[PDB]
Amino acid sequence: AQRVQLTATVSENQLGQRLDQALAEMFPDYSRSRIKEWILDQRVLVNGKVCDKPKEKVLGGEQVAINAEIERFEPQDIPLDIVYEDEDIIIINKPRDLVVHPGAGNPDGTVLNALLHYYPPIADVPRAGIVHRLDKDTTGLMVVAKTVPAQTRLVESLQRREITREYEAVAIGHMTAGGTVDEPISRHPTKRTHMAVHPMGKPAVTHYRIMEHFRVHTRLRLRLETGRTHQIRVHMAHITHPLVGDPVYGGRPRPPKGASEAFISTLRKFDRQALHATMLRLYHPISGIEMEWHAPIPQDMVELIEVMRADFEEHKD
Amino acid sequence: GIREKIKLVSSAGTGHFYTTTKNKRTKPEKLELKKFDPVVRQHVIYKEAK
Amino acid sequence: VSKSEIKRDAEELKRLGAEIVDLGKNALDKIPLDADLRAAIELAQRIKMEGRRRQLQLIGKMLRQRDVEPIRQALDKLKNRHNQQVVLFHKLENLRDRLIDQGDDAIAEVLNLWPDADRQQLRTLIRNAKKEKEGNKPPKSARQIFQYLRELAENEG
RNA sequence: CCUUGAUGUGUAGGAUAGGUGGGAGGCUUUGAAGUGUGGACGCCAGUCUGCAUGGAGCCGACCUUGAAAUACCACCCUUUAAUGUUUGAUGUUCUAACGUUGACCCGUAAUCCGGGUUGCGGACAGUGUCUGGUGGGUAGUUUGACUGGGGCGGUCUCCUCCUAAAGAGUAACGGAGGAGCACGAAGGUUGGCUAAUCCUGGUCGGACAUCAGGAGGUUAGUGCAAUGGCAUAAGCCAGCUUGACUGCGAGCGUGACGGCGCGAGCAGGUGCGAAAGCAGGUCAUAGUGAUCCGGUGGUUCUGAAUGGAAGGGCCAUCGCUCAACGGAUAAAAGGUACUCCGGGGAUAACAGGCUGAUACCGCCCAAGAGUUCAUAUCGACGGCGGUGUUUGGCACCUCGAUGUCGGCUCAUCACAUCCUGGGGCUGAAGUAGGUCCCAAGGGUAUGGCUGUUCGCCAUUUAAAGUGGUACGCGAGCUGGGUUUAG
RNA sequence: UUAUUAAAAACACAGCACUGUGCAAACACGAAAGUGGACGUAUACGGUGUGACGCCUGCCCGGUGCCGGAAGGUUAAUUGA
């Protein structure tokens, strides 16, 4: 709340137009809809009189006075599962429903806000030391360099594509063999929350392998080169083999023939995206010795592969 | 279009006139032009170019 | 860009010219029309129907070669169909009660913005306006107040 | 509307300042500054005034105001005071018009009507003529021609080059375009001059600044699109200039014609140069509109008895996006699967015969991959052929009728063969296989889904063949899809 | 209900809602008389929408239609300086 008086005089070039617009040009910092709600609140005076009709026509020679309130990111306490912490690097296991960068609607409660609470002066480095983005619905390992010279080496490594990243994913369909996918990608022409494959898009490379199959699903291990927004999902979906439980990019639900009631519940229970990062490899900033870390399989994935293993060993066998 | 059709009346007392077109926008000054007049059988000045 | 695109644009101007001739003599002088066009208007209604077509061809002929928006905009005010005209009357009556009920706090805006306002006569008019309303007399002078403001609205001179 | 006297407070400021000119003075003993009431304006802030008291006088730049005067002389604007003139609007009273599907009496043993009394409205309503507005409720029409599609658009006139086949002309949904102006100079005459591009040199100065010297006599320019021309220059500059004139104009060309263009030369008056001569527009080809009917001027041309006048005629003249541009109205948009009538295969769709753009089939050229080894087996870049059952277009039609998709009954023909039969090769040990050749004698499925053709699935066998039959078969059946009318 | 291809999900239906109507009612039939409404009287008549019953019918007057208000601008017949 910032209670500051706002009084101004309308000119003679706003003739024959409404109330919301007139205050907009003279007050550039506040737009029509912000003005509209305060008009309905009976807190704006025109010619010394309060008005209740925003669609009035005002021309000029009037003194409008707004007597009301007006108004980087506040840190919040979030539980984080620390994997490795020292003076140069920070390895963190990001839990479910936690976005790595706050936006319009999430001022506090994200990774950056939690890192601000975890270490107060962490705001010195840009973006609080995050180097690559990851979906909030997907859990996995995240890397943050503590010191700013490590930031320069890390971003340069990705430009040369030196750091290797590994992912664990569960998809639909009886897979046969691994391979590579190389398809340019750009924004979806119609929907603004989809990043679809486009022939004249940004070039991309992704590799995928398989560890074991299932009834109509699979468990697979793969490596991603470029950590762009939702790269792994579309390249897995461009071969019409969408991820299991993905609501945005995965296909429509398709339970298998003769599926048990418990199996159908698990897909309903597993209502998040099937993605996880297990193994990350990095080069130390000032030492030059490789570090290797592993991420335990999350509990939801443990039961997901368990129910599929029982179903596959019962129906097909 | 932009041109304005004008009439040139003899400076003498006769009513015989000639028809022509002048752009008033670029040449608003009245013309000082003399042309043959059959009624007076001589050459007479023409004025009042609109 | 298209010959027929010009055609409908020209034809739209033709019916606009046909509207001017169908307008009364008293209201004809209101629009800022040139004398050459004005003289052609009076001959247009008195000519026989076939000559009206030729006159309509005439009226369209030299009206296309000049600018049309001020003529159309001025015609719109007289028809009271342009949006800025009706709101101008709205504020013109909006300053009436702002002035007819006080008489002193509203004259400042008029003189500050309009330099052709005769404040010597405006104060006297309000004196009569206050007298008739206070004595519950018929408003025989309230109409003249609006005429003066309306006359000064379009540069009476 | 006619005088009659005041009447105009944003501000500093002696203080209730109206704009346009004269203005340092008019007025007054035909009796004054300044004191009081009466009437009266009136935002009581202030002011005008009959009267006499009074017994001889008032201002103006003054410094300030955007603007300086009750110092005066006028056109006057607004507000408003009091008579007379003219015309409206509103309100009140009454009845005698008019209304009364109020009561009563009579014609009259009558809920019609008329007559009489009274009550209630009342000059209202209502009615008649004209007029403003609304008015597809109703009536008469229009929606032109060229082909396109869910709805809309574009073209119609003129000019340039090619198509155009060496006179002229010559079309297409043939390829490129432009014009509806402009110029009183950018016309005429006279005189004068000749650029692009590049070399060297030269300062700010660069790929132009303007040039000194050079090969080029036009590849530059020619108001604008293109073409043809332009050195006698039509290109460039300067003086004078109006021939961009009036009445003509033999003759020729182009078109069916209206029309359009060239036009020597004659009479008059002109401009240029001394003169010979040129000048009836712009180097030319598009820059446009015939007639009917309108404005102006002239013509005593005519003037429904005489003289005029009105009107009409002739001449010049401005008068079209009449653009649908040889121009049906001055005035007009759409649908009809609710349609009808008279015609048309003069004009679409499916099928039939041209066709192979695209794609299927065969062959050849053979770098390369192939344990050695090209065609044992593939084979990149290309070429030649065939049904042609997809996706298409072309002239031919049955519109005085050519009935479909699919299912049932019925089948027939070709083999580019699904099985059975005879073989070749094999990277064919046998069975089981794969490819190719010959061979059409026979056989070549049952059910759920959907109207299905097709296809998926379930289950058999030797397979559950491919195409023609106008993608067979309604004067054999079916009406499930398509299906007018709800 | 489509006689003579459509018997239905279509029409209608009691109910519900809005609007018009004070009697010489609105409206309709009729150049008009007059008649129906109705020899009824706003718990009545006409028009429109929906269509048992239960829970309900949310927001918006911008354009059109309707009502009221009229401050103002334009505006014919009429009269003739």
Swiss-Prot record, chain A:
One term of GO molecular function: rRNA pseudouridine synthase activity
A GO term from the CC aspect: cytosol
Catalytic site positions: D135
Observed phenotype of the null mutant: Severe growth inhibition, makes only very small colonies. No longer synthesizes pseudouridine at positions 199, 1915 and 1917 in 23S rRNA. In this strain a miniTn10(cam) insertion has occurred; the first 196 residues are present followed by 12 extra residues before a premature stop codon.
Any one of the GO BP annotations: enzyme-directed rRNA pseudouridine synthesis
Keyword list, A-Z: Cytoplasm, Isomerase, Ribosome biogenesis, RNA-binding, rRNA processing, rRNA-binding
Reaction it catalyzes: uridine(1911/1915/1917) in 23S rRNA = pseudouridine(1911/1915/1917) in 23S rRNA
Subcellular localization(s) per the UniProt record: Cytoplasm
EC top class named in words: isomerase
Taxonomic superkingdom: Bacteria
EC number of the protein: 5.4.99.23
Matches recorded under Pfam families: PseudoU_synth_2, S4
InterPro entries: PsdUridine_synth_cat_dom_sf, PsdUridine_synth_RluA-like_CS, PsdUridine_synth_RluC/D, PsdUridine_synth_RsuA/RluA, RluA_PseudoU_synthase, S4_RNA-bd, S4_RNA-bd_sf
SMART domains: S4 (SM00363)
Residue span(s) of domain S4 RNA-binding: 17-87
Protein family membership: Belongs to the pseudouridine synthase RluA family.
Function of the molecule: Responsible for synthesis of pseudouridine from uracil at positions 1911, 1915 and 1917 in 23S ribosomal RNA. Other positions are not modified. Uridine isomerization occurs as a late step during the assembly of the large ribosomal subunit. Member of a network of 50S ribosomal subunit biogenesis factors (ObgE, RluD, RsfS and DarP(YjgA)) which assembles along the 30S-50S interface, allowing 23S rRNA modification and preventing incorrect 23S rRNA structures from forming.
Assembly mode: In late stage pre-50S ribosomal subunit interacts with ObgE and DarP(YjgA).
Protein name: Ribosomal large subunit pseudouridine synthase D
UniProt gene name: rluD
UniProtKB/Swiss-Prot annotation, chain B:
Keywords attached to this entry: Methylation, Ribonucleoprotein, Ribosomal protein, RNA-binding, tRNA-binding
Keyword Coiled coil carried by entry: no
PROSITE patterns hit by this protein: RIBOSOMAL_L33
Record InterPro entries: Ribosomal_bL33, Ribosomal_bL33_CS, Ribosomal_bL33_sf, Ribosomal_zn-bd
Top-level taxon of origin: Bacteria
Gene Ontology MF: a single term: structural constituent of ribosome
Gene Ontology biological-process entries: cytoplasmic translation; response to antibiotic; ribosomal large subunit assembly
Keyword tRNA-binding belongs to the record: yes
Gene3D superfamilies the record matches: Ribosomal protein L33
One cellular component term from this protein's GO annotations in UniProt: cytosol
Family membership: Belongs to the bacterial ribosomal protein bL33 family.
Further facts: Surface exposed on the 50S subunit.
Quaternary data: Part of the 50S ribosomal subunit. Cross-links to the P and E site tRNAs.
Protein name in UniProt: Large ribosomal subunit protein bL33
Organism: Escherichia coli (strain K12)
Organism lineage: Bacteria, Pseudomonadati, Pseudomonadota, Gammaproteobacteria, Enterobacterales
Gene that specifies this protein: rpmG
Curated annotation (Swiss-Prot), chain C:
Domain of life: Bacteria
Coiled-coil region: none
Disruption phenotype: Slow growth at 16 degrees Celsius, accumulates a pre-50S ribosomal assembly particle, although some mature 50S subunits are formed. Ribosomal proteins uL16, bL33, bL35 and bL36 are missing while 23S rRNA helices H38, the L1 stalk and H89 (part of the peptidyl transferase center) are incorrectly positioned.
Subcellular location field: Cytoplasm
Gene Ontology CC annotations of this record: cytosol
InterPro entries in UniProt: DarP (IPR006839), DarP_sf (IPR023153)
UniProt-listed Gene3D superfamilies: PSPTO4464-like domains
Matches recorded under Pfam families: DarP
GO function term, MF aspect, one: ribosomal large subunit binding
Keyword tags: Cytoplasm, Ribosome biogenesis, RNA-binding, rRNA-binding
Domain remarks: Has several regions, N-terminal loop (residues 1-25), a central domain (residues 26-105), joined by linker (residues 105-116) to the C-terminal domain (residues 117-183). The C-terminal domain is not required for function, while the N-terminal loop is; shortening the linker decreases assembly.
Stated role: Member of a network of 50S ribosomal subunit biogenesis factors (ObgE, RluD, RsfS and DarP) which assembles along the 30S-50S interface, preventing incorrect 23S rRNA structures from forming. Promotes peptidyl transferase center (PTC) maturation. Binds pre-50S ribosomal subunits near the 23S rRNA L1 stalk, where it may mediate correct positioning of the L1 stalk.
The protein, known as: Dual-action ribosomal maturation protein DarP
Origin organism lineage: Bacteria, Pseudomonadati, Pseudomonadota, Gammaproteobacteria, Enterobacterales
Gene field: darP
